[PDB]
Paper text:
The cellular retinoic acid-binding proteins CRABPI and CRABPII act as gatekeepers and facilitators for the passage of all-trans-retinoic acid (and related derivatives) through the cytoplasm to access retinoic acid receptors (RARs) in the nucleus. In this article, crystal structures are presented of the L29C mutant of Homo sapiens CRABPI in complex with naturally occurring fatty acids (1.64 Å resolution) and with the synthetic retinoid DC645 (2.41 Å resolution), and of CRABPII in complex with the ligands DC479 (1.80 Å resolution) and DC645 (1.71 Å resolution). The retinoic acid-binding ability of both CRABPI and CRABPII is centred on a hydrophobic pocket created by an orthogonal β-sheet fold and capped with a pair of antiparallel α-helices formed from residues 15–35 partway into the sequence. The pocket contains, at its most buried end, a trio of residues (Arg112, Arg132 and Tyr134 in CRABPI; Arg112, Arg133 and Tyr135 in CRABPII) that are responsible for binding to the carboxylic acid moiety of ATRA, usually in concert with a water molecule that is conserved in all structures with similarly binding ligands.
Wild-type CRABPII expressed recombinantly in E. coli proved to be reliable for crystallization in a repeatable manner and accepted ligands for co-crystallization using an equimolar combining step prior to setting up crystallization drops. Seeking to identify ligands with unconventional binding-site interactions with CRABPII, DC479 was chosen from a number of small-molecule retinoids designed to substantially improve upon the intrinsic fluorescence of the retinoid family and particularly for use in high-throughput binding assays. Of particular interest was the extended carbon chain to which the carboxylic acid group was appended, improving the flexibility around the head group, to determine how ligand flexibility would affect optimum binding into the triad site. The compound binds to CRABPII with an affinity in the 50 nM range, similar to those of other ‘strongly binding’ synthetic derivatives, and thus was an ideal choice to explore ligand-conformation space in terms of interactions with the protein. Additionally, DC479 has been shown to cause the activation of nongenomic pathways whilst having no effect on genomic signalling; a result indicated by a lack of neurite outgrowth in tests with in vitro models. Indeed, its interactions with CRABPII may indicate why this is the case if the effect is caused by carrier-protein interactions rather than RAR binding (or a lack thereof) in the nucleus. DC479 occupies the binding site fully, with its carboxylic acid head buried adjacent to the canonical binding triad and conserved water molecule. Correct incorporation of the ligand suggests that it is not interaction with CRABPII that prevents genomic signalling in the case of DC479, which is discussed further below.
Numbering used by the authors: 1 to 137
The structure:
């Protein structure tokens, strides 16, 4: 079974720490943390073609990409960035991000499928590592 699914979060570490290092102020961090507690995550995968929708009441992100072909999205803190996703295996994709404008910490994300049917999202901003684990429902 591939990345396709409706994914439900079961673990999170260091989400607020991630927003902190990206310069998001306390009140905005509190809104984002509240929204991130209960996201709806939709992934449709066809080979290298991906649709990923992460939706909360206050902020929804939808990206369409092909692994290996560059695209524009936002960083986790809403900064426009150039993205490129590569395979590290059939079960792990790694995305390197470059800001369009301004200055800021180096950002990246990884999505990995475990043999036990979990999805692990890793988001980094310089030193800081945020891990979110999802299961299908
Ligand atoms: C003030 C509100 C509208 N605001 C602006 C600042 C920013 C971009 C940091 C943010 C981020 C989020 C947010 C929520 C969930 C996720 C991730 C969820 C997931 O992948 O499970 C990412 C960002 C929500 C809300 C939010």
């Amino acid at each position: 079974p591939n990345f396709s699914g409706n994914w439900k979060i079961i673990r999170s570490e260091n989400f607020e720490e991630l927003l902190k290092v990206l310069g998001v102020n306390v009140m905005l961090r509190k809104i984002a943390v509240a929204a991130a507690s209960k996201p709806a995550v939709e992934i449709k995968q066809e080979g290298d073609t991906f649709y990923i929708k992460t939706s909360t009441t206050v902020r929804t992100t939808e990206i369409n990409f092909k692994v290996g072909e560059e695209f524009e999205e936002q960083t986790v803190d809403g900064r426009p960035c150039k993205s490129l996703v590569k395979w590290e295996s059939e079960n792990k994709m790694v995305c390197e991000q470059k800001l369009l404008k301004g200055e800021g910490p180096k950002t990246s994300w990884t999505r990995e499928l475990t043999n036990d049917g979990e999805l692990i999202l890793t988001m980094t901003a310089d030193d800081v590592v945020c891990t979110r684990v999802y299961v299908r429902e």
